[model samples]
Target: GSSGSSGYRALYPFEARNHDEMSFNSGDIIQVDEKTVGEPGWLYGSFQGNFGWFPCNYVEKMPSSENEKAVSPKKALLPPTVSLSATSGPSSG
Candidate 1:
């Protein structure tokens, strides 16, 4: 799924400064996982099917346009949880 319109995106290339984490190229897209927002320093996301914690400052929400401001870690409101409710989608018997 290359088109992660609603996912976190790598702002700059990351080459894992530590062994406990993985790396990512600039513009790499990762789907946010079950991590609580307002947490400091780390985020839980998955890239290329591997899920783990990544540095929060390394990623940001996809830009809305060329003129839009970049997302700031202190100012950003990351989703506390993914609300995948059953009522919003097609019902199954």
Candidate 2:
């Protein structure tokens, strides 16, 4: 899923001269697991302009594109925790 809009990772995890272990970048799409589908932590970081977490196994790396920039991480981050009387959707997708 692409952002279909425009934006980028918040902090550019890249160091001015460092090129190792890139952390935050909207372009770094990773699918860690079936449950944690779509871009991994980076997507959230890039979108929300902050760091987020997900179980490593629940993520996967995917292709990157400028479209991925369109993600509104704040919007994506808004989800309710499980509640006995609350209902959930079939897919976040």
Candidate 3:
């Protein structure tokens, strides 16, 4: 696939549990298709020539320059909050 946005680096290791899933190790750089498909919180991308879906939370977007250090200049003063219990289920009675 053609390039999309900036690439991502795995923040955590993920093991593929299904046929459509992709496994990646921490620090592995991945080329992701940001236009997501399949389920929420999951993204499609290619890692080392293999491609499949992986959890979005497991990776962080990388800067355009690969030579830059991974450390952030400043820590976030406030952590981001995640919504819970909203739209918890699919279309069901």
Candidate 4:
């Protein structure tokens, strides 16, 4: 399969302390394409159309349908639906 974004959501607010990082708020969504770059415990992605690196712990893969605006991660585990799929993030193999 092709490499792609690993969906991550912010756990809490973060303010970039330096050039290599970026700021984000709680509940903010990000696309985690790379786990780390120049810093440990950090990831590279775009947030709200702004691309940068953010803390790994501050982000995570959300599974619950209640959180994501898109489909839930649980979707693939269950049968297909008509209105909303149960999968979160996009389809991947």
Per-candidate Cα lDDT values, in order, are 0.66, 0.36, 0.78, 0.69
Model 3, span 1-93: residue lDDT tens: 124455889998888888978888898998787776777877899887568888777889877774755554685598789876655556866
- Model 2, 14-92: lDDT tens digits are 3223322224443444322223345444233222333344333223343454344554546445667875766766876
Kindly list the per-residue Cα lDDT of model 4 for residues 53-77, writing each as its tens digit. Answer: 7666778776544564653456456
Ranking by TM-score: 3, 4, 1, 2
Error of 1 at 17 (Å): 2.5
Model 2: number of clashes? 11
Separately for all candidates shown, the number of backbone clashes (residues 3 or more apart, or on different chains) is 0, 11, 0, 6
Those runs of model 1 whose alpha carbons end farther than 4 Å from true positions after fitting are: 1-6, 34-39, 63-93
TM-score of model number 4:
0.53
Clash pairs, candidate 4, are 71-87, 72-86, 72-87, 72-88, 73-88, 75-86
User: Which residue pairs does candidate 3 place in steric collision?
Assistant: none
TM-scores, each model vs. reference: 0.48, 0.17, 0.58, 0.53
- In model 4, the runs with Cα more than 4 Å from the true position are 35-38, 64-93
- What is the alpha-carbon lDDT for the whole of candidate 4? 0.69
Question: C-alpha displacement of 87 in model 4, angstroms?
Answer: 53
